[PDB]
Amino acid sequence: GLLALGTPLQWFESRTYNEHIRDEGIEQLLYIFQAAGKRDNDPLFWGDELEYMVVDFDDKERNSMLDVCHDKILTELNMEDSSLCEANDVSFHPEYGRYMLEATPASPYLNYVGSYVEVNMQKRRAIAEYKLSEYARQDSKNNLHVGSRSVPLTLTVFPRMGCPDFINIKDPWNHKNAASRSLFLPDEVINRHVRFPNLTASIRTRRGEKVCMNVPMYKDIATPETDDSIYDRDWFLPEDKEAKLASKPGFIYMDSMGFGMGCSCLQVTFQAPNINKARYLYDALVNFAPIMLAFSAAAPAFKGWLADQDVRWNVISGAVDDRTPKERGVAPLLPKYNKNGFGGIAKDVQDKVLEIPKSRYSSVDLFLGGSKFFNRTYNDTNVPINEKVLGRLLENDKAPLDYDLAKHFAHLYIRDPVSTFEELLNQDNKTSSNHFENIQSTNWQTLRFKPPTQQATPDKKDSPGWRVEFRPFEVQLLDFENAAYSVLIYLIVDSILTFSDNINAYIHMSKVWENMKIAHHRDAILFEKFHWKKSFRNDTDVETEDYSISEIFHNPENGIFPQFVTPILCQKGFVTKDWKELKHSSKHERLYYYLKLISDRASGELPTTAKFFRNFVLQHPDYKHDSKISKSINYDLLSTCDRLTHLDDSKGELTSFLGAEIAEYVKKNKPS
């Protein structure tokens, strides 16, 4: 489904309704609860979301660019080609990036669907490729993008983002980018749907300074002292003057939403039997998030540089961080512009501003509790709340909520709305959840607790129930990797729900936040250590020790395989003792190779995508020992990515990247 249009409101015009929107949205929340609160027995439907990047290989120029010109695809697949999609059980939606695709199954999977995940993901890829080859045919006849070859790649990061000649538009700086006002990203990186440039503007204005994301550079032998791509400019005030102050020696400087939301990830959503189970599942998936973030790492480079981290998360965290310097407890960089650190916050409300520690895109703040093992002391972190909102969720005549669950919403509501259409100002709170969806959906966290709609009353057995979204996974090049990780979380989720009586996953939130920073460090999967529970089978216990990813996956006591994966395969009867038995199974071979891919990366035998791209850059003939990714390095890299994506072992790169056994296996074995 394509996002439907309207009159967007710019920040100065919109900010006067922040409070109207919040009130009305809570009201809607209340109705959702009153109507759907008592759903029970919802089945385990679930599905993934994939995100893709259309890359234009200009082979003759030896240049890989982001393709910002075939974006009609997203409308085509949703109008005249919406039937191809449906026939095929796939669905396409727009994403921040004009070069980006997003796609899901058209219907959620029900329980264990085997290789069908991968099948469905491959159909998504084939359809994009199909339409692209169509455009290539039309273009040829219209004499357009000559020498050009567009391919969709599930990259987490585009390695040359905001670097010279990184988009397939001639002379993109010959006009101004009023939306980002970025030094590096022409606004053509933004998807045309009004919502996206709106968000981009609203945050910058609210903030009163460009977003700013500094990423530690890798320290090669000739690496410059500073990010020498910073330049001075006079299009925009204050923005063009901000760089000198905001940047830092030994740090990749990035200054635009697209650096973050122009990144891709894998997401999986799950429906629990009911709100109570959903709380329990959400809570228990909290510490999986930073672990899977480390495990899945696929983004070792930004803005032309090898970074000294392997994942996207902090970059996306900064890319939409609407916090004024007031909200961050820091000096404005340009005080005559950003008046008293309040940026765009209306005068009449500056007095009710709070120091807020985390970007509205950031790791979960609070366990929701409501289950045997939960105790409020686990929420041991700084989490500012909207007390009016808490008040009203505690004391109202439609759905009085428990304190813990009230606090979660109360925390989401410390944010202002950042894109609102004029049409939409007054809703019927009994039927619309749009206003709440405004705040719900611009709190982008590692999980998301998804209420349903007011229309999802218990008698309606088919409407979406109470869901948990697992958001941290970096996205992988191959549909096999992404299916594998999708099934991993599926199994974990199933385990969790099947043994809900016996699994205590709680740990102090503060260790989770720490985990979330460890998870960024370069080669983290290979050696760093994380706070993980000592035992899950054990009421009244919340000890952690510090384990490696290898341990966290494989420890008999508290490992993901022996504690989560292996047990649920037993009660389903896929094996009797051990997951490895699958290698020999008739009905279930592919599952073996998923889990083995998973195992072998956790134990460091097989590399992460992040590792593999790093090695690749580091040993490229044109590599200059200075952390620089040149057009050429980028081109050959993305060329490998293309072949890898297609199981093309002609240069032994697949064997090199998945090892012999698995490479052979997938080369010789297509899904279901």
Ligand X SMILES: N[C@@H](CCC(=O)O)C(=O)O
Binding site for ligand X (CB under 6 A): 51, 95, 261, 263-265, 312, 316, 444
Which of 76-84, 101-109, 151-159, 520-528 is the region at the interface with ligand ADP (rule: CB under 6 A)? 101-109
Residue type, 570: C
- Smallest gap from Cβ 483 to ligand ADP, in A, equals 13
Closest distance between ligand ADP and the C-beta of residue 452, in Å?
A: 9
For residues 289 and 640, what is the distance between their CA atoms, to the nearest angstrom?
29
x/- map, 97-116, Mg ion, by CB under 5 A: -----x--------------
- DSSP code of residue 562: I
Smallest distance from Mg ion to CB 94, Å: 9
- Asked whether position 105 contacts ligand ADP by CB under 6 A, the answer is yes
- Report the alpha-carbon distance of residue 171 to residue 475 in Å, rounded: 31
Candidate list 45, 342, 436, 480; residue touching ligand ADP; CB under 6 A: 45
| Site for ligand ADP contains 46 (CB under 6 A) | yes
Q: Which of 307, 319, 299, 325 is nearest to 362 (CA)?
A: 319
| Widest pairwise Cα distance in the chain | 71
Q: Considering the complex, what minimum distance in angstroms separates the CB of residue 463 from ligand ADP?
A: 8
Q: Using the rule CB under 6 A, is 304 a contact of ligand ADP?
A: no
Cβ(469)–Cβ(266) below 8 Å: no
What residue is closest to Mg ion based on CB? 267
Dihedral of alpha carbons 81, 101, 133, 647, sign: negative
Instruction: Return d(Cα 268, Cα 276) in angstroms, integer.
Output: 20
Which of 149, 183, 147 is closest to 163 using CA atoms?
183
Can you tell me whether residue 544 is helix, strand or coil?
Answer: strand
Chain breaks in the chain (C to N over 2.5 A) after: none
Task: Rank residues 267 and 504 by Cβ distance to ligand ADP and give the closer one.
Answer: 267
First and final CA of the chain: distance in angstroms? Answer: 27
Q: Tell me: does residue 269 bind ligand ADP (CB under 6 A).
A: yes
Closest CA to 3 of 174, 183, 193: 193
| Sign (positive or negative) of CA dihedral 18, 22, 24, 25 | positive
Decide: is 482 part of the binding site for ligand ADP (CB under 6 A).
no
Q: DSSP strand E in 581-669: where? A: none
Supply the minimum distance, in Å, between the C-beta of residue 527 and ligand ADP: 33
Site residue total, ligand ADP (CB under 6 A): 16
* Nearest CB to ligand X, comparing residues 261 and 414: 261
Nearer to ligand X, 95 or 327 (CB): 95
**221-260 b/e with 16+ CB inside 10 Å = b?**
eebeeebebeeeeeebebbbbbbeebbeebbbbbbbbbbb
| Structural contact between residues 510 and 517, judged by C-beta atoms closer than 8 angstroms | no
Residue nearest to ligand ADP as judged by C-beta position = 47
Provide the minimum distance between the beta carbon of 471 and ligand X in the complex, in angstroms, as a whole number.
6
Phi first, then psi: give them for residue 109, nearest 5 degrees. Answer: -60, 150
Residue 108 in contact with ligand ADP, rule: CB under 6 A? yes
CB of 664 to ligand X, least distance (A): 32
The yes or no reply on residue 474 touching Mg ion (CB under 5 A) is no
Binders of Mg ion among residues 267 to 286 (CB under 5 A) are 267
271 binds, among ligand ADP, ligand X, Mg ion, none (CB under 5 to 8 A by kind): ligand ADP
Residue from the set 49, 71, 209, 255 that interacts with Mg ion by CB under 5 A = 49
**Site size for Mg ion (CB under 5 A):** 3
User: What minimum distance in Å lies between the beta carbon of 450 and ligand ADP?
Assistant: 7
Cis peptide before 238 (omega within 30 of 0): yes
Please pick, from the candidates 271, 338, 434, 555, the single residue that binds ligand ADP as defined by CB under 6 A: 271
Which of Mg ion, ligand X, ligand ADP, none interacts with 467 (beta carbon under 5 to 8 A by kind)?
ligand ADP
Rounded Cα distance, 328 and 322, in Å: 10
- Give the residue, chosen from 24, 27, 48, 310, that forms a contact with ligand ADP under the rule CB under 6 A: 48
Applying CB under 5 A, which part among 77-85, 265-273, 427-435, 607-615 lies near Mg ion? 265-273
**Are residues 199 and 416 in contact, defined by beta-carbon separation less than 8 angstroms?**
no
Among ligand ADP, Mg ion, ligand X, none, the one that 264 touches (CB under a kind-dependent 5 to 8 A) is: ligand X
233 Rama class: left (phi>0) / alpha (psi -120 to 50) / beta:
beta
For ligand ADP, give the closer residue by CB, 112 or 561: 112
**What gap in Å lies between CA 257 and CA 655, rounded to an integer?**
36
Between residue 182 and residue 211, which ones bind ligand ADP under the rule CB under 6 A?
none
Question: Which residue number, 51 or 653, has a Cβ lying nearer to ligand X?
Answer: 51
Q: Write down the least CB distance from residue 101 to ligand ADP, Å.
A: 12
Q: Which residues bind ligand ADP (CB under 6 A)?
A: 45-49, 93, 104-105, 108, 267, 269-271, 464, 467, 469
